[PDB]
């Protein structure tokens, strides 16, 4: 929307993501990033699992769970989006390779610009009348890629050249992230309470709950098939289970009139909660295994 609250929420979200990603940049080194780029095994596995089987899984879920055209289209669009920045946080939460995580995120976000319209054209035949090709936000994708890439370089430069300041930088980031998270939560709660509780089909909730768990399991099994270390398996699993929902929300809000988007009003918000809740559950399971094995 064009309300001042929405733009304020977007600004605070951008600040939060910038500071989070700058804080995460510490655990990255240019040598390991270059090595992972030079011989791509986990990157290839992640790209395959992202744009070869996940869209198929979304299509099959739309067919099995009897869903309407708009719900099936929303699930399909969510099954084609890049990983997003939640995968980096999840990959840091468990012991895993972080250089490979940022390589995965950057490569997937860059390949989306050329891979996402083709998948949409292939799969939307029969559930959408028209052309979704030029509704893809190319400018938004490029802006997101730039706003993810810049804090990486800033943090890595700060670590490499001036380690003296980086305790201060970490503490400032950790306080700013908290200060932004509380405000964003308050704004989102205010919007949810003041808006009408639009009804949602229960099958949509079941699909949105099943969808990221399928992603996680697929990523881990695929990484296990080709002999890889535990850290690489975990990081590729977290990137395979995490998807960017703002792109799907933008496409949905630009491709449908307001009177048709009723059933899908809370879908982007609900999808984010499910992968956050299921992502944290797997983090607890892994940590409990390590201590009490």
């Amino acid at each position, epitope marked *: *929307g*064009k*309300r001042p609250t929405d733009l304020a929420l977007s600004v605070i979200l951008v600040f939060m993501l910038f500071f989070i990603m700058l804080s995460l940049g510490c655990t990255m080194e240019f040598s390991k990033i270059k090595a992972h780029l030079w011989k791509p095994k986990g990157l290839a596995i992640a790209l395959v699992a992202q744009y070869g089987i996940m869209p198929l899984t979304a299509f099959v879920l739309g067919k099995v769970f009897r869903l*309407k*055209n*708009i719900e099936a289209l929303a699930i399909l669009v969510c099954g084609c989006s890049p990983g997003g920045n939640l995968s980096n946080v999840f990959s840091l939460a468990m012991k895993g390779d972080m250089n490979l995580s940022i390589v995965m995120t950057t490569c997937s976000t860059f390949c989306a610009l050329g891979m996402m319209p083709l998948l949409l054209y292939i799969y939307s035949r029969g559930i959408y*009348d*028209g*052309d979704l090709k030029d*509704k893809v936000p190319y400018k938004g994708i490029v802006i997101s890629l730039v706003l993810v890439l810049i804090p990486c370089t800033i943090g890595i430069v700060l670590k490499s050249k001036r380690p003296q300041y980086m305790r201060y930088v970490i503490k400032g980031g950790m306080i700013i992230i908290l200060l932004c998270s509380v405000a964003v939560t308050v704004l989102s709660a205010i919007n949810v309470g*003041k*808006s*009408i509780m*639009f*009804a949602m089909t229960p099958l949509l909730i079941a699909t949105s709950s099943l969808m990221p768990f399928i992603g996680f399991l697929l990523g881990y099994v695929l990484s296990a098939l080709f002999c890889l270390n535990g850290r690489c398996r975990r990081t590729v699993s977290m990137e395979t289970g995490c998807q960017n929902v703002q792109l799907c929300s933008t496409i949905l809000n*630009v*491709a*449908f*009139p*307001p*009177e*048709v988007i*009723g*059933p899908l009003f809370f879908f982007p918000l609900l999808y984010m909660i499910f992968q956050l809740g299921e992502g944290l559950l797997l983090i607890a399971i892994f940590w409990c295994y390590e201590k009490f094995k």
Partner: antibody, heavy 126, light 109 residues
Framework: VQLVESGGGLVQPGGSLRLSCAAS????????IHWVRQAPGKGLEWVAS????????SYADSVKGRFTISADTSKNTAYLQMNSLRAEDTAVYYC????????????????????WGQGTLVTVSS | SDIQMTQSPSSLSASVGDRVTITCRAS??????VAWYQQKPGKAPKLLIY???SLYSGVPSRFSGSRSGTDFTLTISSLQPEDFATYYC?????????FGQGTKVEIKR
């Protein structure tokens, strides 16, 4: 705000016909236009909808694949093209515009149809 | 792939000044996306109530709407000689828009 429809007439079964909806007082490009059918002696029947700005187009199950809806911003008109017409398609066709969403109140959704056309009669007989 | 909307009273008989209630039942949740229309013989339909409870501008205060779950009702407080017509129930939440069967209000005798 007015909706004027034309193009109704008599066609042979399996033929083709195109209906027009000349709108006044508003822009068809930024509005949603619906076509409603009323068979003689029966109730109302939704057919198709067009939203030019969003590139959105929907059809009923009965007419899917045979009907095509379009809109022209230059002439401010909306068109419905009917192909392979059957004897079940004889009716009076109405042009309807959806409620205009109000930006001053972002929360209400205003579900309904504001304005209707006089209607044009289409008969399909050999 | 449509949402059936059952208009229970297919024909109603009433006199001038009586209170008339017409109910509409939705086969699935459609939120508050229900509108009511009034059609007279040989004329186009006219909107009366949008969003299942709001009175459209220019419609007299007699007409009213209410929603109770998937159940929607249309009420006329005092019937007038110009209120004898056919009324239609519509839903607009899902992509295939569906109407009600219809209810014709006639003069009792």
């Amino acid at each position: 705000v007015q909706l004027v429809e034309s193009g109704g007439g008599l066609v042979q079964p399996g033929g083709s016909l195109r209906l027009s909806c000349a709108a006044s007082g508003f822009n068809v490009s930024y509005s949603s236009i619906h076509w409603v059918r009323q068979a003689p002696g029966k109730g109302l029947e939704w057919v198709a909808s067009i939203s030019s700005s969003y590139g959105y187009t929907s059809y009923a199950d009965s007419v899917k694949g045979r009907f095509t809806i379009s809109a022209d911003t230059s002439k401010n008109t909306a068109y419905l093209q009917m192909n392979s017409l059957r004897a079940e398609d004889t009716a009076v066709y109405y042009c309807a515009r959806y409620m205009k969403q109000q930006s001053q109140m972002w929360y209400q959704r205003y579900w309904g149809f504001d304005y209707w056309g006089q209607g044009t009669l289409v008969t399909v007989s050999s | 792939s449509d949402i059936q909307m059952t208009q229970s009273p297919s024909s109603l008989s009433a006199s001038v000044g009586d209170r008339v209630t017409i109910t509409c039942r939705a086969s699935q949740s459609v939120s508050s996306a229900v509108a009511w229309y009034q059609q007279k013989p040989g004329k186009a339909p006219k909107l009366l109530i949008y969003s299942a409870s709001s009175l459209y501008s220019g419609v007299p205060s007699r007409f009213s709407g209410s929603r109770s779950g998937t159940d929607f009702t249309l009420t006329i407080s005092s019937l007038q000689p110009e209120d004898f017509a056919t009324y239609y129930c519509q839903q607009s939440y899902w992509s295939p828009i569906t109407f009600g069967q219809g209810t014709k209000v006639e003069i009792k005798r």
